[PDB]
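ping. complex inputs:
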Amino acid sequence: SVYGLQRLYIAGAHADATSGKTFDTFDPATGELLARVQQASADDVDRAVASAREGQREWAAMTAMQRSRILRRAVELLRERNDALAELEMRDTGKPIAETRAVDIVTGADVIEYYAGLATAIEGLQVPLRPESFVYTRREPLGVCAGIGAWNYPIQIACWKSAPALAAGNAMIFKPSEVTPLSALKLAEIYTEAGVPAGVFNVVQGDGSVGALLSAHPGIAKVSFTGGVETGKKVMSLAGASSLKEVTMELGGKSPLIVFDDADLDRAADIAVTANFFSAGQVCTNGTRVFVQQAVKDAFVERVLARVARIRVGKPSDSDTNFGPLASAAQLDKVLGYIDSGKAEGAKLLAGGARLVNDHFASGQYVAPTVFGDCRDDMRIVREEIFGPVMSILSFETEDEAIARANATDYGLAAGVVTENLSRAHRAIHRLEAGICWINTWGESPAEMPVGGYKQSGVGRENGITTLEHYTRIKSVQVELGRYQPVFG
Amino acid sequence: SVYGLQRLYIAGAHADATSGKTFDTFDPATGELLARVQQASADDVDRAVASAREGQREWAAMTAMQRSRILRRAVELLRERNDALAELEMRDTGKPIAETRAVDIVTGADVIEYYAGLATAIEGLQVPLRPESFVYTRREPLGVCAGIGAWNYPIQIACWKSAPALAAGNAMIFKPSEVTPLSALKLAEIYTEAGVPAGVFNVVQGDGSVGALLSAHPGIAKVSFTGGVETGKKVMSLAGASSLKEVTMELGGKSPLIVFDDADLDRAADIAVTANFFSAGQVCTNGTRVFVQQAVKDAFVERVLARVARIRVGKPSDSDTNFGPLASAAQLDKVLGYIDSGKAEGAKLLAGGARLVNDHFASGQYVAPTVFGDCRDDMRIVREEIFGPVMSILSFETEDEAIARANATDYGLAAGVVTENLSRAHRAIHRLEAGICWINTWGESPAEMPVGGYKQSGVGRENGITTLEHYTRIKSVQVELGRYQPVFG
Amino acid sequence: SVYGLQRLYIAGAHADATSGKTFDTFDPATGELLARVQQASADDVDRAVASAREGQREWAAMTAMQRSRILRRAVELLRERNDALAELEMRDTGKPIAETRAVDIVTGADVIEYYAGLATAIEGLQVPLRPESFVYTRREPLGVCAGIGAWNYPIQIACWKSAPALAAGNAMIFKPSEVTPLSALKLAEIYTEAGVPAGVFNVVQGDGSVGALLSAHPGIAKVSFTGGVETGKKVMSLAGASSLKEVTMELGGKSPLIVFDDADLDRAADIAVTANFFSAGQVCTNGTRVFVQQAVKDAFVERVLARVARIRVGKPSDSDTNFGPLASAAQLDKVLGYIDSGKAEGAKLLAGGARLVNDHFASGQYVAPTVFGDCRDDMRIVREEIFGPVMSILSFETEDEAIARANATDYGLAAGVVTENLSRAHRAIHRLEAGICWINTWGESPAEMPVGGYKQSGVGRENGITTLEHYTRIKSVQVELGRYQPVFG
Amino acid sequence: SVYGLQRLYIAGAHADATSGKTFDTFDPATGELLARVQQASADDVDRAVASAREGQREWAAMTAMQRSRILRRAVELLRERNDALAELEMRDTGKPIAETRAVDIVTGADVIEYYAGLATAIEGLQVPLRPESFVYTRREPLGVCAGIGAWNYPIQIACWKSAPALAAGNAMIFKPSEVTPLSALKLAEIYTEAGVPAGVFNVVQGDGSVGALLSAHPGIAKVSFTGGVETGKKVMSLAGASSLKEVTMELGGKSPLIVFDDADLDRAADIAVTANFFSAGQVCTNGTRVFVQQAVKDAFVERVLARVARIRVGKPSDSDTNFGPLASAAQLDKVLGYIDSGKAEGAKLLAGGARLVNDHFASGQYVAPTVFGDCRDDMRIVREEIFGPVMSILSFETEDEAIARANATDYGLAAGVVTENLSRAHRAIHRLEAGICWINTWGESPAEMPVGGYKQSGVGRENGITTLEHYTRIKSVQVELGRYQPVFG
Ligand code: NA
Ligand code: NA
Ligand code: NA
Ligand code: NA
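pong. complex structure:
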C-alpha cells in the first residue's frame, strides 16, 4: 500500500488493536490501496477510555494558560506541516489538493488557535442571595468526550471537535470515518509533540460499530457526531439510552439559496456554483435547492451554466484541478441513482449528469458537475440530501412563496439569500428556518460563528464562544454564611 | 369524586379527549377518589401541537416587554390564589399543607417572576470579520416545546419548565404525572387569564404512553423531562431517534452529605433531617447518603435521632403536620421493600422502619421517617435511589475517603458538606461530582441558580439565566458587504 | 402662580430648603408664572447625602426581587398618572401635549420597567486559578449617585438616570434643570408611594451652583450629567478633582444625516423633518447637518419643504399642535442669533427664519421651523449645536466625501443614513464616528440600546444592560485554599 | 553614564525630542548616573499623536487574529529577554534582581499573553425590537489612548496598560515615570520587532508636564494613569475639562489587613510581611494598616518581628537580596519624615526606623524595614499612604470594630482578612470597602482578576475581561426594515 499498516493512537503512541480485524482505505481518484487499518475492539475502546481518564486528570490540573500555550504550539506545527498533511488528505478523500492545501488544515488550525486563546476566559458566575448567602458556579470539564468524524473534512472535523474539548480541559477519543482514517493519526502525533499529555487525544479506528462502542460507553460524558441524519438519530438515541450523555449532532441538509430579482446576478451565479460543487458537492451546508425569482431566472441560469462549464475537472493531485472524484464508489452509486431519479421525474438536465470514464477517470469515482432546471418541490432530488454535485434550480414568483418553500423541509442546516436590498436581505433571513445563514455570500465558517442545524439537521453547535462553554458542565455552589434555620423544628 | 371530571386544556379552554380512556387520581392520605381524568389520544396530541404552533406565532410576534407583562400578571394571580392551589396540591400529592402553602406555588411563581423580568435581555452577539463582513446571531424561539412533570412537585415543575420556555417566546405542551394531574390545569387557566394566547400553554393528560407521544412527535423541537433515571433514558432515546429534539433531563440521585469532624453538629443534624424527610423523603436532590467523620459520629447520630423523634407525622390537611404519607401505594411498596432490604443486608435500624396503620393512618400510604446506621457502600439502600424517607448513615475516617466514596456512584445530582473551615468547605465541594452543591445548608434552589445533574442524573439545566438561553436556538447570520470572490474562476 | 410654592424632596417627604433663595419657573408658551421654587443650600445637599446614605443601606439590604417588585409598582403608577404628568411637563417645558402624553412618561417608565426586570440578573464572575485558589467578583452598589437633568426631557431624564441606579441598589440625589423643576418631584412621590425607602431618590433644586455642590460632594460616588458640552466639561473636571467620582456625560451633538442617491426620498424627508423639529428642535441627537447626494438634492429638498409647511405650529396645550415654543427666552435669543448668523454667512433661507409674534404667539417663545439650503462646512450654523429648530442642508458628490465631512467634527453623539442598499447602509454606518447610529429611521431609543457620545459628545452610556452594570463597582475576591508560600523566607 | 543617551520612541524608531531639555535617571542603590533622557516637547506629543493615529488605522484594519499573533510574538520576545530586562529594571528602580527577574517582566508578559488570546472575543450584542427592526452594537477601538506609568513597576505597568489597548485595536502613547524611563523603550522595541505597526506603541519622556500634555491633548480618546491620589485628581480633571476623555485611575491606598483570633498566625505573619515590605514597601495595594484581634496580638507581633529580622537587606544587584533601597532621595526623605511623625505621635517602634548608612548603603537610599506597634487611628502614619516600608499594627476587640475602622478611610484600593472560618472569611470581605480583596493570602494579581480602587483610590479597572471591553467604545446601530412612520404627518 502507499502508506502502509495503520493502527490506533492510545496513551501518547501508536498501538495495535485487539480485534483481529482490519479495513482498507483507497484513493478514490485511482483505486490505489492507501493503507490497511487495524479496527479497534471493545477492549481497545475500554483502554482508550481508561487512558483518556488518566490524561484528562493531568490536563485539567494544569492552568488554563498552560493549556493555551500547548494548543498554540499545536497550531504552529499544523501550519508548518500544512502541505504534507494536505497531500495525505487529498489522497485519502479525493478532494483537490488546491482545496486541502488552502482550506482543510488552515481552518482546522484556525479553530484550535481560536480556542487556545480563549482557554483562559471560561468563567462561572457569582450572585448574592442575601447578606448571609451567595452562589457561585464552576464550569468544570465534562471529562472524557467522544468525537465521531465524517469523511468529507477528516482532519478539519478532528480539529473542530477536539479544540473546544481540549481547551476546556477535557480529553477526547476521536474516531475518523473508516473511509478516511489517516489524517486523524497525524493530528494525534502533533498534539503529543505540542505537549498534550498521554491520553488527552486518543484515536480509535473502524466502522459504525466502533462508533457505537463510543456512544454507548458509560465512561464517556459527551458524544459529538458529524454525519448523515439517519445515522445521527441512532447515535443520539444510543448516547441517551446508555448513560444520558450530552450530545452534539452536525448532520446533513437541503439548504435553500434564494436568488431574488434584485440580486447581483454575477454574484448570485458565483455563489450558487460555490454552494453546489466545492469538495465535489460533498458539503453538508451546500445550497442544493437554488430558488430563483422568475424575472431573473433565464439570465441567472445562463450565468450559472457558463461558470459550470469552466469548472476544471481533473486529477485531485493536480493543483490546476478544482473538482475531482467523489469519496467512494458507494457515493458514486448513490449520486448517479439520484441523477437517474431526477431525469425520470422530469427535471431538465442542463449540465453534466454522467460518470466520467475516459482516460484516467475510469480508475476513479468521477461524476460530472450536474445541474437540473425546472425542478419541482415534490421531486426526490429536491427533497433529499444527495451529498454530491447536483444543483436543483427552482423558479418562484414572490418573496413569501420562496420563504415558504425554502422552509417546507425537515432539514434546517443552512440558508442564504442574494439581494442588493437592505430590508429584503435581513427580513428574508430572519424568516428562514436554518441555523447557518449567509447574505450575499456562501460557505465561510469563521471560528467566531456558531454553526449547527435547526430541525433534523442537528443538535447543539460548533465554533464560537458558546461551543467552548458547552464543553464544560455547570456546578452551582450555594454558600450559607448564616445560621441554618431548621425546617423540622 | 372530590374534584369531579377532569380533561385536557388545549387552545385556551378545557377540552374533551378522544381516547375513550380515563384514569383516576386519589388522595394518598385517605384513599378518596379525587378525580376521573380523560387521557389524551394520539389525535389529541396532534391537536395540541397544531394549537401550540398557532399560539406560538402570536406569542413570538409580541415584543419581549409584552410577554414580560403578561407573565408578571400570571405571577400576581398565582400569589393571590396561593392558598387555594396549595390545598389542591396537598390533596393530590399528600404533601403537608404546611409545605404546599409555603413552597410549591411560592417558588413556582418565583421562577416565572424571574424569567418574566429577564424576557427583555435575550441578546445575540455581533462580531466583525473584516471591514467588508460581519456576523450577528439571533436567539430565536425553539417553537413548540414539551414538558413532562413528576408527581412530587406538580405545579412547581409546571412553572419551572413553562417559565423559561414562554419567556423566550415558545409554546409548551405540558403533561403532568398521572399521579398528580390536577394542579397543572389551574396553571393553564391562570396563563390564559393573564393574557397568554390560546395554545401557548396546553395540558395533555395520561401515563407514560402519552409522554411517549410527546417525545416522539415531529412537530416538537425540545422535550424537558423530570423523573426517574430509567424513564429519562427512554425519553431521551425516543426524543433523539424520532426527530433530533433538544433535551433537558432532571433525574434522580443518591446525593452525598458529608459531615466533617469540624462541622457545627447541630447545624449538620438539622441539615441531614431536612435533606432526608422533607416532602416525605420524595425529593430528587435529597442527601440520602449521610457520611459522618468517625470522631463526631456518635454525637451527630444522637442529634439526628432527637430531631427525627420531633417530626410531626400526621394528616397532611393539618397545618401542624410536617410529614405526611407517600404519594401512592406503589411508592409505599417500593420504600418498604428497601427497608426490608436494608434490614436483611445488616444495616442497623435506628428510627422508624414500618408502615403506620393506627387510626386514620391505615387509610393512607404512611411510612415512618426511617434512619439506618452502620451502613456499607455495597448495600442496596446505599447504592439505589429510594425516593422515600430513608436516611443511610455511613462512617468515614479521612477527607479523601469521604470524597472518593461520595463520588463512587453513577448518580450526580446534588452534594453537600458541613464544616466550619474555609479551605475544607470549598476544596471538598470542588472535588464532588455533582451539579448542585450546598455548603452548610441544603435544599434551597434560588431562581438564579442553575440546577441539574452530572453523570446519569441529568442532561442540561433548569433555572438561572442559562436556562432562558437554552429555550432559544442560535441563528448565525454572516453579512457580506464586499464583492464575493469567486471560488470557481 | 399656577402650581404654587415648590421645594425639596428629602427623606421621603417634601422639605424646606435652607438657602433663603428661590427661583421662578414659567410657561414658555404664555409667560405665566408656574411656581416659585426653593433653592437647596450647601447644608441641604449635605442633608440629602446623609439621607441617601441611610436609605441606600435599607434598599441594598433587600433582595434583588424585592427591589424589582417596588420598581415595577413605580411603573404602574407612572402609567396610571401618564396624562396628569404629561400636562405638568407640557406646562413646564413648552413641548406639545401630543409629545408629553405619548413619549416623555411612556419612555421614562419603559426604562424603569426594563431595569426592574433586570435587577435580578446582576452577576459577578468566578474563575479558578489552580486547585488551591479561585477568584469571584461581587458587583456592589456604588452607594450614593448624583443625577443632573436637562430641561428638554425633564421627567424622562430623571427616569433614565434613576432606573439603573436604583435597580442596582444605589440611592440617587437628582437635580432637575432650574428651567423645568416640577416633574422630578412627582417622580419622587411615586417612588415613595411604590415602596422605595426614604432617601433612595432625593430631589434638590437650583441652578448650576447646586449642580456643582453635588459634583464636588465627597460622599457621592458617581455623577451622571445631561446637558451642553461646555457645562459637561466643568462637571467632569469637578467630579474628578474633588473625589475621583465615576462619571457619565450625555452631551450635545451636531449629528449628520446622510441621504444617498438610492435613498427612499419620501422616507428620507420624513426622517429629516423628525430629526430636526421634534420637541421644537431641542434634542441632543437631532440630525442637524443633513447631507444629501447631488443627484437627489432638488427632489429631496422639495419633499422636505412640503412636509415642513405641514408642521402644525400652535399652543402646546392644544393636542392638534405638533410644534410649540422653545423652552425659554434665552433659548429664543440664541436660536435667533444663529439664524442671523446663517443669513449673514450666505446660507439660503428656505423656510421659517423668524420669531412668531402674531396673536397668542407674542406671549411665548416661538421660533418658526427653519431650513437653510446651500450650506457650507465652515458656517457657524453648520459647526455649532444650535439646540433649536434649524436644519442645515449640505450637498455632496461621493460617499467617501459625505463620510469624511460627517466625521469632521468634535461632536460624536448620533449619525444616520438613508439608503435602500444593503452594503452601503452597513459600510457607511460602520465608518461614522458616533455612538448612536440609525439606518432608514431616526430618533427611537429603545431601553435595550446603549446610547451615548463619541469624542466631546459624552462619556459612558445610558440604557442597555451595560448601564445597569455601570451602576455597580467590581470587588474582586481571591480565595486562597492552600498554604501561603512565604515570599520573605 | 551606564546606559547612555536616551530619547523618544515614535513611529517605529528612536527619535530625538525637540524641547532642548533632558533629565537624568540614577541607580538609587549607588547614585550612579544611568542615563540622560531627552524630554518630549509639545510638538513631540503632537507628532506622537499623528504617528499613533496613522498606526492605529493599520492596526485596526487587521483581523483580530492577526493582532493576536503579533501580541503572542511580543510575549515570546519578553520571555526570551527576561533576564536582560530584569537587570535594566533593577538598575533603574532599585528593586531586588530577585524581584525583577521573577515578577516584573513575567507578569507584564502574562497580561499581554492573556489579552492576545482574548483579542478574538470582543463581541457586540444583537437584540430585536420587533419583526421590522433590530439593534446590533459594534465595539470599536477608542483610537489613540494615553498611558502614564509609575516608577515602582515601570515595564509591568507599561505592559498592563498597553496590552488591552492594543488587543482591542487601539494605539497607545505611553509616558514612563521620569524616575524610571528606561524599560518602556525596550517594550517599544519588542512590539516593533513582533510586528506591531509604526506608531501603535509610542513612548514620550519627561516629568508631569509631559503627562499633562497627554491628558489635555484633543486627539487622545482615553487616559490611563497610575500614581498618587493627588496627582490622579489633577490628571482626571484635565482629561475631562480638555476633551471629555475616558479615564482609568489606579491610585494609592491605605489598605487594611485584618488578622482575626482564629487566623493561622504563621500564615498571618507571612502575609503581613509580604504585604508591607515587598518592593521595599513601594506597592499601592500594600496592607499598611495591620489590624490584629487582641487575643492573638502578642503571638502575632512576635511572629512578625521574627520574620522581619530575617529580611535580607542588601544590594539589589545581589540575588540573595530580597529588600533594597527606595527609588529616590525624595522617597527616602518622605518615608523618614513619616517615621519621625510616628515616633512623635507615640507609636511604638518595634523594628527598623532608620536610614542605613554603613558601607555601601551610604551611597544609596536605604531605609530599614520598619514596624510600629500600639498605633492609633488618628496617627498620620495610620491615616496617610507612606509608600515605603512602614507597617502600622493596630489592636481591635471585635469583628464589627475591625470592619468599621478598616472602612473609615477615603482610600479603598485593597483589603484582606486572615481566618480559618468559612462564614467569617466571606462575610468580613463582603463588608470591606475595597476593590481588591484577599482571603488568607495577599498580593497576587492574576490577569483574570479585575483590579482597581473604591472611593479615592481609583476609577475604572485593569486586567480581567472587563478591561478589554473598556478599551472599546459602543456604537449602537438600529436597522429599520419597515416603513418609517412619519411623526410630522
Ligand atoms: Na480513502
Ligand atoms: Na393523586
Ligand atoms: Na419652565
Ligand atoms: Na532611576
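The two ends of chain D are 78 Å apart (CA to CA).
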